[PDB]
Point group: D2
Chain length 261, copies 4
């Protein structure tokens, strides 16, 4: 009778629930917060307090960015179609991972690879252009070296105050000085910031070996950060459409080009 399931993160078979070896009462006695629970359940580690707080700040900063982005819009459409909360949320979450919400992960990987390989920022920039590859985590539809992004400033201020070192973030900022020298909209965007700061946390907070940090980036920890954070906003938009008593939506024919054979 060899067990068909295997699990590492939570044991609810005893009288008191356990998260990664910490009884739930100790989680609260130690004031771990949501960020510390995430460290237990996603990484099976008791993270330092500043790392737990940084995780919570990432969830707060990614909670929403308005009703116009793909996933919020799809949730809103479901809500207006009279659907339940979970269906509507899911409809929006399913838009995430590539062009919407995927740049956190892509930036963490692309910057880590350049940094680890020893290529300097100017040569990384020149390489990616000669190769016609966009630098993930760089560029924004509206923000600029003159209209800075406040979410970037907030997270940047915090990690510099608490992290032992932020080498990948510093490298990414050297890239930004070069890219914005040319095009002022090629800033380090909020997705690139979270991505590189999260690598710096995993690599420098002391709870991970390099191999462990590399594995958690590879299996999608950062995808999870964006998904969990933005779920709060999408549920908010679901509730908002119901509070505003919004009826069924159908897209107007004027905004659609039909090109049949």
């Amino acid at each position: 009778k060899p067990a068909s399931f295997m699990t590492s993160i939570c044991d609810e078979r005893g009288q008191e629930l356990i998260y990664a070896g910490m009884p739930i009462t100790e989680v609260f006695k130690e004031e771990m917060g949501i960020g510390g629970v995430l460290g237990l359940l996603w990484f099976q580690k008791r993270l330092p307090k500043y790392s737990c707080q940084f995780i919570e700040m990432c969830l707060m900063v990614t909670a929403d960015h308005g009703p116009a982005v793909s996933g919020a819009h799809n949730t809103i459409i479901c809500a207006r179609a009279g659907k339940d909360l979970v269906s509507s949320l899911t409809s929006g979450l399913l838009t995430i991972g590539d062009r919407f919400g995927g740049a956190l992960d892509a930036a963490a990987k692309m910057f880590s690879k350049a940094f680890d390989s020893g290529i300097i920022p100017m040569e990384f920039v020149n390489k990616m252009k000669k190769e016609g590859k966009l630098i993930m985590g760089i560029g924004h539809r509206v923000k600029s070296i003159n209209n800075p992004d406040m979410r970037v400033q907030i997270l940047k201020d915090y990690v510099r105050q608490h992290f032992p070192a932020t080498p990948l973030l510093d490298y990414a900022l050297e890239v930004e000085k070069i890219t914005t020298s040319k095009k002022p909209n090629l800033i380090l965007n909020v997705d690139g910031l979270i991505g590189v700061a999260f690598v710096d946390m995993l690599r420098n907070c002391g709870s991970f070996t390099r191999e462990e940090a590399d594995e958690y980036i590879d299996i999608g920890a950062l995808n999870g950060i964006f998904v969990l954070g933005r779920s709060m906003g999408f549920i908010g938009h679901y509730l908002d459409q119901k509070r505003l008593k919004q009826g069924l939506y159908r897209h107007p024919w004027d905004d659609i080009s039909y090109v049949l054979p």
Copy 2:
């Protein structure tokens, strides 16, 4: 060492043996007997070998519900998800999850509501007035763009087939009388495709001979009818996904000028 009772029960398909079985029909007999997709649905959903005209009706329903353009909630969401770079299954399901009481999934409720009124003995006008006195939408009635001035050819095709092939259509007849009343008052309160398929399946299940009344009522109650639209329209949503990938449409973001922001 002791025998553990099985935790799951299943009735529709057996893959354990020398050949696949659908509701007791071996797959070789399914094809020998020319059961087609409609007959396989009869086996897997209704546990019966249905008459040929019923199998053909099921296929007609899947064909007429296959798509209704990119503007409807589910197609719009599938398109947005494809344009966000997502895979076929994620994009399809993002659209399917819009299907419900307002878009696409009123077949269950329409069958139940019309059956109740019909079986209760109230006449069509009394049904319309009662729903109005309560605060209740007539499910299977109404459309955002189709109307008495813009008729739905899907409904016509289905009606035509049912009248030629079904042995009895009392609920469809009742529903058309209702539609006569609702469209006099408001021109887009037509019998929509959900309502037509809903009442036509009630007529089929009650009168085709393969079901007892108890069985027919149970299939309405557990939600079989909505599956017809879900399975049908899945072909269109997959089409939209493929279309958007071929067209290489980029990431969508809704325009701010179409949104009224009213924060506290």
Copy 3:
């Protein structure tokens, strides 16, 4: 001409210099140390809530974060991850199990207990009447926790509410119901759905940011189920990552656990 807008929105404005959550700029959200609980108060309830309320919301997300791999949603997420799928697919395969039976009884519990309380029915008459009809008490019952196997999640929440909330009439009523139901069936405890449900009603009704009608509306539109959905999303993502790190392979349910009864 002025074409009217087709969408309305009230919770977040990203158009300006600085992101705004429900009228609070993101800089002030962090200066005021609102935390995740305060952001939820802003985005879901459109209010700046007191700190003890924000901390209670965070506690609810922490205590609902996971309850093992055996429950319906974690099971489905694990199986989807073992099928090689991506994080979002695997998470949502499990979230879609949340409803009346597993995880999503908070809406119904809050509505049913609020209705009983507001009507003046005493706990025993509430129990007998649901018993005399065929209606489950939402927020009562558990497959494995019981009077002999208590839920520490419930204990932690009750302790916090008792220390910080200004009033707890619905919780007190629900605990009276639990005494009655567990007298005859040891598994009919007040579960985490019912506890969070009734505690949230007590919070919304008495925190001072809502009229009774406004609080009742949030129950009616289904806000409280979101608390479990968002909370448990953290555990389901954890299960996905766990299965990927464990290199667990494709799952297929054993035939010996399935009774086939075809026509």
Copy 4:
């Protein structure tokens, strides 16, 4: 400029149109479900035998029992009291890689070998040398003298009705080599459907090679499996409701908990 563009269906007129054919003409021409799929997925009026082939694939893939990942997940949702769409979707979301992905995988692998100009014996050897299993080959029980009847049925139709089947021919030569090594290593139903579908696209007359390859690459065969198996998943949903099955919780005896200390 219009924000949406679409090619497959026009519902703006009085009469609905599928890819240039009015719906009344779809029925007058007895296009069937296969012909509708040709219009909506490919914007082509496919030959009759191609349309019938498509319907046979949907029938053959409709279900394969309650134990596979997606059917199981749908069953769990149904036992949790959820609605049809939620329960169906929970199961569909398991599809694409280790479950339900072999039609696509086999189409691609065989097409790549064939287009390499490499002969079957060299393909088998290249794959052994690269450590790769051959997609669409192998079955747990059936054998060169105990055949899979789904393969027999579809193979017979294809060989009787397709004018040319070069990729199937190629795959049958691979199978003769692999069944010499192990009588178990048959072309399975996913391999058959995969290569036959490629043959249909490449040889039915309606597509250029570029178009055929594009439809494979963007997931047309994933679509065939999803649409086909959706019929069975809906069946399982209804079955669980009919059988009045209550909430499931997996037994602790079948679970190995390995938390940190």
